[model samples]
Target chain A: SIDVKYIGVKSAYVSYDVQKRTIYLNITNTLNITNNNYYSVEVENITAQVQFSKTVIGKARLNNISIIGPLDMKQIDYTVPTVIAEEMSYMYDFCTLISIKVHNIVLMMQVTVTTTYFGHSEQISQERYQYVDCG
Target chain B: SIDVKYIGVKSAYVSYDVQKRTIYLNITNTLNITNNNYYSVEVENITAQVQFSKTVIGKARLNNISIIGPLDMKQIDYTVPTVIAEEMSYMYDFCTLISIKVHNIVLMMQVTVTTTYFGHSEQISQERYQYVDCG
Candidate 1:
């Protein structure tokens, strides 16, 4: 078995359960907008935060993430060449989490990321943006 | 009462409670790296998702968020001028979420985001990164 974990888009879940209808949304947010470990792109100096909720029966599987927000959607084409060459040697032993479309919103769920040295672990990153209606 | 809501580092709560200790961590993540709505900086083609767990008992007060991660951690100076000007007028009517450190990892919890026209609503966004010991 692989050791799975979520990296980006840190912690997410429904604050208020929508009783009206199931909604799906595309989400996006900036993680380390700056290269500093002290500040965040969204939390640096702005009073802004984004949240979405969906009602699912029991537990649902969420994976295959995508960023459906503004300013960040333009980078989808060159996704293959972008490699986060950080000093963390444990990156190789991780998995990736994917985004899922539940109702009117797309969620940033966890998935597995595979590497050479560390094998595979799970990861995902959520940001702020406008969502797309895939349905 | 005030329309209390959390934004910035969106919905976050304890998944697996820890009985051993109460720790604090500083976290960070980068959103919209490539400035695209379709492809996010961390989730474009990279199979990486980051997740951190915190153990909070009986609900704790979380606010004033920060970012703690790699790659984008160097941009701590430009957070003020970095305005995410989109067409959505609802931007101003939101609150922000802050990151709270319950144990070893920091959490992306919600906060209140305020604007001029729409008054205030809560918002927050979370991404991947390393955690710092606040205590």
Candidate 2:
């Protein structure tokens, strides 16, 4: 097992589609998985979700993960595309305001990663806040 | 590495004091950590929290944990006492109503477990629903 953590967001896109009455959000989150073992750790089956004000608006799954060497660190890029609902109209508008005014948008992210260490596979789940550069 | 999961709640108590106008909730959540490694795994520093609606109403931290042998399963009992806020009156009352009618109570639980495997320390975070036998 490795020490996994959600650092922050690398990039974010916040826009509204007036025709569809929908928001287009693309957030690329950053994660740091540290391996302290003497041998390499194989990571795979990466799945994650992003929630804003209790609404799950984006999701991602990557089957081919990276391998971290002994005492090395791996940075994971979890890109979540839009999966919106009419119910999230208010939150969408609110985050857009924050993005425009503050240039930074924050949301809750749940990341799950599976890795093999000590000849056994371990699934680690983590939840943290991702501060995105909305600009 | 192990397969850690939050199955459900073991026992739950829902009561309120009219004088304090405060709800007293004692929930015991159940978790399963399955170790498939050939060696033993040591788990410690267990911390968890329970949220009602969106308010964190209970928390638990256990520094002393257990050890599981190879290919064995270990059950963890996370007991959280009451930690209240005046903002939770609506949710507290609503859950009480549901518990009375259905004899079931549900809430969001965030459980973090720190374990030593492959000569390294790994912290796993999981957020899941705990179904309690409220009666």
Candidate 3:
């Protein structure tokens, strides 16, 4: 068993596509993954997607591997999600409005984790909430 | 057995709370419940929550029961969610903005259904997607 917690949004940068009417957000969030197994486990990969309601505006993938000790936790320090290239098409306008009219925007972050132990593969996932300030 | 589908947003009315920076939206969505069972069954109740992302902006509860014939379906014609009194503390601005700035807001609707037959009970649930337009 493993544990994942959505800490919060660290920072973000926004831009818009003129022709497509799409919005791109590069949001950074702080999160930690806890290994609950008795023996050490090898983490295969970690992926994340940040969205408003129905559209995704941010994404990150770490195909890289890291050795996690038994029952240890680690803070994803370096840009867990490098950037949001996928772009938010449908919910982009609404997300943009909140940042301008309102001070905070509550977004959802979905993280996917893959771990391997004793030749067995395991998966963990959850949707974390974070508030981003515009003004 | 039972089935649920989120058709789309019918119409919406918007208002704002200047002091608290909250916006209230009265959004109507069209949805339906299908009884896949071979025999007639009784619908216990139906509940729904429509949200922007992290906050619920609209809610509805229909405790009144109705008999659904075998393989029959019914459309929730009259105001599935009467209003958004629960109040979306956050993301209300964003939803309002998209409706004002972009003309459409894509939101998530979570509906819960309960059905009973011959003293047996079962539950059905799903997160339906809908698009609301503002002009």
TM-score for the first chain in candidate 3 comes to 0.16
- Native-vs-model 2 lDDT? 0.26
For residues B1-135, write the lDDT of model 1, one tens digit per residue. Answer: 111232433445312222333332342323433222221111111232222212223333333222212111111121112223232221221122222212122232222121111212223335344322221
lDDT of 2 by residue, B20-132 (tens): 23332343323332323242344223222211122212242222122222232122222223333322222222112121112122222222222222323333554423221
Model 1: runs farther than 4 Å from truth?
A1-116, A126-135, B1-73, B79-135
Candidate 3 regions exceeding 4 Å error are: A1-6, A10-135, B1-69, B75-96, B100-135
Of 1 and 2, which scores higher on lDDT?
A: 2
Q: Judging by TM-score, tell me the better candidate of 1 and 2.
A: 2
lDDT of each: 0.25, 0.26, 0.26
Write candidate 3's Cα lDDT for A1-135 as tens digits: 323323231211221112233232343333232323232333223232222242223342222123222332222122212233343233333434242221111222122121211112222222222223343
State each candidate's chain A TM-score. Answer: 0.12, 0.16, 0.16
What DockQ would you assign to candidate 3? 0.03
> Which scores better on TM-score, 1 or 3?
3
The superposed Cα distance between candidate 2 and the true structure at residue A114, in angstroms, equals 16
Q: Model 3, range B3-71, lDDT digits (tens) per residue?
A: 222222121122111233333234332323232324233322323322223322334222212222223
Q: Candidate 2: which stretches are off by over 4 Å?
A: A1-121, A126-135, B1-3, B11-123, B128-135
Q: Considering the two chains of model 3, state its CAPRI-style docking category.
A: incorrect
**TM-score for all predictions?**
0.12, 0.16, 0.15
